[PDB]
Amino acid sequence: KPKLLNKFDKTIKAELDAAEKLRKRGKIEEAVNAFKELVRKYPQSPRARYGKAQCEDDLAEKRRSNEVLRGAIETYQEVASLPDVPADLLKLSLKRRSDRQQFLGHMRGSLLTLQRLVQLFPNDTSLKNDLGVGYLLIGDNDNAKKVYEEVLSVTPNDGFAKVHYGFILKAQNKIAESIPYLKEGIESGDPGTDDGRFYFHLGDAMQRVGNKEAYKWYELGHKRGHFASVWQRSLYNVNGLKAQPWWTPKETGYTELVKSLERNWKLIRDEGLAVMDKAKGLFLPEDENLREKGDWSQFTLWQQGRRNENACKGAPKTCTLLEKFPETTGCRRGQIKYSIMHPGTHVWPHTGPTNCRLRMHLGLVIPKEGCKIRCANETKTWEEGKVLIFDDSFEHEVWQDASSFRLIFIVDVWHPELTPQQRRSLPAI
Amino acid sequence: GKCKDGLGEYTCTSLEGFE
Ligand SMILES: O=C(O)CCC(=O)C(=O)O
Ligand SMILES: [Fe+3]
Ligand SMILES: [K+]
Ligand code: NA
């Protein structure tokens, strides 16, 4: 269906097809030398150059080599420098470049490729949509929002643009504005709209505005396979792990860790209070838009299984104690952090990103009334020197209506059923 | 940005190529 042969390439079509047939059969090494001779004998053939780049792509896949793939990326670009390149071939080659550049983590490089595509094909709406994705991946929501606005100005009912526009609005706390975009986008059925991210935030946005129909979108996200359950809505999951809102120390197996926290809880408290009094700046405000109201800060010692050395200078005894427990210092999908919360604070119902961690809370300073945490349909209270354990991949919520501050210690551990091989291989979150 | 407590980012992992 795609036209990939310019006038000259049609005159060597049998040579080109013979080389491609070698590649489709999996004879990658013979297809590499086939297209190499084609590139040597016809250095201006776009189809021969695309064949070279495609063989390198399969060779990188076969060898799991980033460097080989990097050679493919450059060759994909060489196709676009050749003269008399068909438009279909020009798009395929450069789109695959951005795709492989993202797979390697070269977000700034994919960005340039995507910009060249929009310039070379200013009437392709999908290429503008892909440019917005490149921005969303690098962290540039401002340029991502302008892109989808330009898309919506021309094609206002493009569903892909609507869900991404809605996602950007929600992330910017424009809750009410984002609902009609996330809803119309998902309902459009356009390619790219059936994504758990859009179901997740559409139901959360509706929850924040008191829209009772929020769970209808959680239910449909479960039916479409994006959520393990209507309650447990994490999106970076290992399937099969025991789903349970609340956990007991013995259920987790980390009883040695729980005893150490509950035996030495006062030293952990004291170092926290000491930071509160003489190093307030180490406590950083929560910055994921999880608060309806109030004040909430976190002092993080371990993140992504990495220890912050300067943070541990503020709690050296606590960091010394925790280093004996790799099930938490090595949880690259969790943290170790003090969490302080003051009266007048309500944390929105939310869920964490992954089901691969369990979350421990050690009570350090707990006022006698006004503090409580709900996970799923069960609500509990903290206690000074005791450890609660819950799966934050379930929906959870917190209120702080005391008359003084409430300080706890948050300790994430790998899900107990995760094998050591999985704990080493899972990408960090 | 990183997804520490929620799912607010478009992507929560960092791409590092092949494994
Ligand atoms: O109560 C706190 O300090 C934080 C509550 C929460 O949402 C969590 O620990 O996941
Ligand atoms: Fe939480
Ligand atoms: K503070
Ligand atoms: Na030539």
User: In whole angstroms, how large is the CA radius of gyration of chain A?
Assistant: 27
Q: Is residue A230 part of a domain?
A: no
The response to whether A296 counts as a known ligand-binding position is: yes
Number of neighbouring beta carbons within 10 Å of residue A144: 24
Between the CA of A20 and the centroid of ligand 4 the distance, in Å, is 18
A107 annotated as ligand-binding:
no
Do residue A172 and residue A88 come from a single domain?
yes
* Residue showing tokens 């094609």: A155
Residues A281 and A209 in one domain: no
Q: Is residue A75 part of a domain?
A: yes
- Which of B8, B10, B13 faces A288 most closely, judged by CB atoms? B8
Give the closest ligand to the alpha carbon of residue A347.
1
Give how far B19 is from chain A: nearest CA, Å: 7
CB-CB neighbours of B2 under 10 Å: 16
A291 & A183 share domain: no
- For A14, counting Cβ atoms within 10 Å of its Cβ (0-12 exposed, 13-18 middle, 19+ buried), the class is exposed
User: To test the ligand 1 pocket, which listed residue (A396, A399, A405, A429) has its Cβ within 8 A of the most ligand atoms?
Assistant: A396
Ligand 1 atom 5: the closest Cα is on which residue? A398
User: Both A255 and A318 in a single domain?
Assistant: yes
Residues A217 and A167 in one domain: yes
> Which of B6, B16, B19 lies nearest to residue A352, judging by beta carbons?
B6
Pairwise CB contact (< 8 Å): A105 & B15: yes
A406 labelled ligand-binding: yes
Q: What are phi and psi of A34, to 5 degrees?
A: -65, -55
Question: B8 to chain A, minimum CA–CA distance in Å?
Answer: 6
- Residue B17 · residue A363 · CB < 8 Å: no
- Contact call for B18 and A65, based on CB within 8 A: yes
User: What is the C-alpha separation between A319 and A324, in angstroms, rounded?
Assistant: 9
Residue type, A184: E
Q: Which ligand is nearest to the CA of A359?
A: 1
Q: Which residues contact A400 (CB under 8 A, 6 or more apart)?
A: A294, A296, A341, A342, A343, A344, A345, A346, A370, A371, A406
Cα gap A114→A140, rounded to integer Å: 14
Tell me: do A219 and A254 sit in the same domain: no
Contact A336, A300 (CB under 8 A): yes
Please indicate, yes or no, whether residues A396 and A272 belong to a single structural domain of this protein: yes
Of B3, B16, B18, the CB nearest to A429: B3
- Do A301 and A182 lie in a common domain? no
Distance A406 CA to ligand 1 centre (A): 11
Domain of residue A353, CATH code: 2.60.120.330
User: Please, which experimental method was used?
Assistant: X-ray
In a domain, A92, yes or no: yes
With respect to residue A42, please indicate whether it lies within any of the assigned structural domains: yes
> Residue A336 belongs to what H/E stretch?
strand A335-341
Question: CB-based contacts of A63: which residues, under 8 Å, 6+ apart?
Answer: none
**Is A302 annotated among the ligand-binding residues?**
no
A186 near A163, Cβ under 8 Å?
yes
Pairing verdict, β A335-341 and A296-303: antiparallel
Inter-CA distances, A48 with A35, A85, A92, A273, A277, Å: 6, 11, 14, 68, 69
A288 C-alpha to center of ligand 3: Å?
Answer: 18
Strands (E), A125-253: 246-247
Task: Please indicate, yes or no, whether residues A290 and A160 belong to a single structural domain of this protein.
Answer: no
Q: Name the resolution in angstroms.
A: 2.4
Asked if residue A261 and residue A308 are part of one domain, the reply reads: yes
Burial grade of A86 (CB within 10 A; 0-12, 13-18, 19 or more): middle
Q: Which one, of A380, A364, A373, lies nearest residue A400 by Cα? A: A373
For A198, the closest chain B residue by CA position comes to B10
Domain of residue A334, residue span: 249-425
Are A267 and A183 within one domain?
Answer: no
Which letter does DSSP use for residue A335 in this model?
A: E
In a domain, A30, yes or no: yes
Would you call A200 an interface residue with chain B, using a CB distance cutoff of 8 Å? yes
Neighbours of A299 (CB within 10 A): 26
Burial of residue A58 (number of CB atoms within 10 Å: 0-12, 13-18, 19+): middle
Angle made by CA atoms A249, A253, A256, in degrees to the nearest 5: 75
d(CA A171, CA A145): 11
The response to whether A361 counts as a known ligand-binding position is: yes
Measured between CA atoms, how close is A64 to chain B, in angstroms? 6
Query: Looking at the domain assignment, is residue A87 inside a domain?
Result: yes
Name A88's Cβ contacts closer than 8 Å, sequence gap at least 6. A2, A3, A4
Write the burial class of residue A76 (CB in 10 Å: 0-12 exposed, 13-18 middle, 19+ buried). Answer: buried
Beta-ladder partners of A247: A389
Tell me which ligand sits closest to the C-alpha of residue A405: 3
CA dist., res. A300 & res. A153, Å (int)? 43
Longest CA pairwise span in chain A (Å): 85
Tell whether A202 is covered by a domain. Answer: yes
Domain count, chain A: 2
Q: Hey, which bits of A217-332 come out as E strands?
A: 246-247, 284-285, 291-293, 296-303, 306-307
Q: Which helix (H) or strand (E) holds A412?
A: strand A406-414
Q: Which ligand 1 atom sits closest to the C-alpha of A392?
A: 10
Strands A306-307 and A371-375, bridge-based pairing: unpaired
**Is A35 in the B-facing interface, judged by CB distances under 8 Å?**
no
What tokens appear for A297 in the block? 């800060």
Q: Are residues A215 and A333 in the same domain?
A: no
CATH code at position A96 = 1.25.40.10
The pair of three-digit structure tokens given for residue A292, joined into one six-digit string? 């309806």
Count CB-CB contacts under 10 A for residue A3: 9
Where does a domain end: A224, A240, A257?
A224
- Residue A388 covered by a domain: yes
CA angle, residues A315, A370, A270, in degrees to nearest 5: 15
A40 backbone φψ class: left, alpha, beta (φ>0; ψ -120 to 50): alpha
Residues contacting ligand 1 via CB (< 6 Å): A 339, 341, 347, 359, 373, 392, 396, 398, 408, 410; B 5
CB A11 within 8 A of CB A47: no
